[PDB]
Design a protein around this ligand. Structure first.
Ligand SMILES: Nc1ncnc2c1ncn2[C@@H]1O[C@H](COP(=O)(O)OP(=O)(O)OC[C@H]2O[C@H](O)[C@H](O)[C@@H]2O)[C@@H](O)[C@H]1O
Ligand SMILES: [Cl-]
Ligand SMILES: [Cl-]
Ligand code: NI
Length: 476
């Protein structure tokens, strides 16, 4: 899961949304480096350091940096695209007055631009410490966004709803970028005397794990089963009138192609699927599917980048969701089970994946994934995908001639780097990635405005590969 075949909904609203996608053209605005740097100096959030910025890079790197800037895009799974459409339909029918008025004329591309542009600058912790684009700082209050009890400064026109942030956890960012240092957790933006020990550049991908810190929102709604959340009143377990909550459960269940969700007392006694945790029950079957969406996007993206680079990809894989967001003891095993599954399902498509390197994992071996293993790939020019499992720094120099594809653990409601923008330069993987690359500008929708935008959305499709959304919709 997911399957290779996607089903096209026949209803007029979906057909119209796809028609509009099929009218989009790829942006091709010439990159003006001086214009970029000026935009960056006027960005609505302050940089604690400049060493990870375009302006601090050598002049002899300007040509490549211009290409890196134009190489950036947001990217979602083809199934995520259909989910976004179904979300718009659901909110236009069941949303509040506040929600209905902002989604009224919104296209798919517009919703994606909103998820990029209206996310907070930072947003971290179980109690939602935040800075909005308008500079307001506080804790909590996002549960009320987009409801008739919403209030300044957390209103739908300014910030995202938790229902939207849950969507945004499926929206990833990718670009080529200079590497400043080896990108260790504690790099803190340090500059090196020379880059003899590191790769000079590569692909950097912001992926987002599942978040369970905050009850009754995000992936907790789908994967966590608790006594207070999983009730008939909240739309679970479904001669009953449809409610907004129950309809929203249905579109997420249909996204995961699950035939039911659960009332707490109705959950089967089955430890191959369910794990008891402090909050209640953790459903590793739906967790595997949520991972599979992220991993499909990553692998199809890495394949496309590597094919255009003319060399195999070396993927630095991090445990998204397994750090400060770790929520179950078997979760890392579900992670690796899911990843092996997608490597095998995608099969011959991954001709240009060379090494998958799991960095900072506690399990040495899950299924066939252990250090030195090779997953065979039909017609792969090197016979298969090499697996590694050991700590490395993402920017370390490669002994093979391969394209480094560096993942970092991001956040659905924060700019790349997240607490980086609160001047916490050493914390989690997120500020470490911002400090050691150019993504704090190149993946920033308020700085890389011509390429990090909804109109440049790309789609990862099992059948059609990685395509700009216009090309993808036209092939449907
Ligand atoms: N010193 C280390 N060096 C490298 N990897 C490490 C280290 N310590 C832990 N890991 C592993 O690093 C991996 C990633 O752990 P995390 O960075 O917490 O990510 P998440 O997805 O759980 O939390 C994301 C949120 O935290 C940020 O604020 C974001 O913006 C979000 O708000 C795990 O395998 C860890 O075991
Ligand atoms: Cl500096
Ligand atoms: Cl050098
Ligand atoms: Ni083996």
């Amino acid at each position: 899961w997911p399957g290779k075949r996607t089903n096209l909904p026949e209803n007029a609203f979906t057909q119209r949304m796809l028609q509009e996608c099929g009218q989009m053209a790829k942006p091709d605005a010439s990159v003006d480096l001086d214009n970029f740097k000026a935009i960056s100096e006027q960005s609505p959030a302050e940089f604690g350091i400049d060493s990870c910025r375009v302006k601090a890079q050598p002049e002899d790197r300007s040509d490549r940096i211009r290409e890196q800037i134009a190489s950036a895009y947001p990217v979602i799974h083809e199934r995520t695209l259909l989910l976004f459409i179904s979300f718009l339909e659901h909110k236009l029918t069941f949303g509040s007055e506040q929600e209905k008025a902002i989604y009224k004329d919104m296209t798919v591309v517009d919703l994606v631009q909103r998820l990029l542009a209206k996310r907070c600058v930072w947003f971290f912790g179980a109690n939602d410490y935040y800075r909005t684009m308008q500079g307001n700082i506080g804790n909590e209050g996002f549960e009320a966004v987009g409801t008739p009890a919403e209030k300044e400064p957390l209103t739908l026109t300014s910030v995202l709803s938790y229902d939207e942030i849950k969507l945004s956890a499926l929206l990833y960012v990718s670009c080529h970028s200079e590497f400043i240092n080896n990108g260790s957790r504690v790099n803190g933006g340090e500059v090196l005397q020379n880059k003899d020990t590191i790769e000079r550049e590569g692909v950097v991908i912001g992926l987002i794990g599942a978040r369970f810190e905050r009850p009754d929102v995000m992936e907790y709604q789908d994967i966590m089963i608790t006594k207070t959340q999983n009730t008939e009143a909240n739309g679970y377990g479904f001669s009953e009138t449809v409610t907004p909550a129950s309809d929203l459960r249905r579109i997420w269940r249909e996204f995961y192609e699950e035939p039911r969700d659960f009332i707490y007392a109705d959950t089967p006694y089955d430890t191959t699927r369910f794990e008891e945790v402090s909050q209640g029950i953790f459903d590793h079957q739906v967790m595997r599917k949520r991972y599979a969406i992220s991993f499909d996007t990553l692998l199809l993206e890495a394949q496309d980048r590597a094919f255009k680079a003319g060399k195999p990809a070396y993927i630095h894989v991090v445990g998204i969701g397994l750090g400060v967001w770790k929520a179950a003891r078997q979760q890392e095993r579900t992670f690796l089970e899911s990843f092996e599954g997608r490597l095998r399902a995608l099969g011959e498509r991954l001709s240009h994946i060379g090494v998958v390197h799991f960095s900072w994992f506690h399990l040495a071996c899950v299924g066939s994934l252990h250090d030195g293993a090779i997953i065979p790939v039909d017609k792969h020019p090197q016979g298969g995908i090499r697996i590694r499992n050991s700590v490395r720094n993402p920017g370390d120099k490669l002994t093979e001639d391969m394209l480094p594809v560096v993942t970092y653990a991001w956040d659905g409601n924060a700019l790349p780097g997240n607490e980086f923008w609160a001047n916490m330069l050493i914390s989690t993987g997120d500020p470490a990635a911002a400090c050691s690359t150019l993504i704090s500008e190149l993946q920033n929708p308020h700085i890389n405005v011509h390429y990090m935008n909804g109109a440049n959305l790309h789609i990862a499709s099992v059948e059609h590969g990685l395509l700009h959304v216009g090309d993808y919709a036209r092939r449907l």
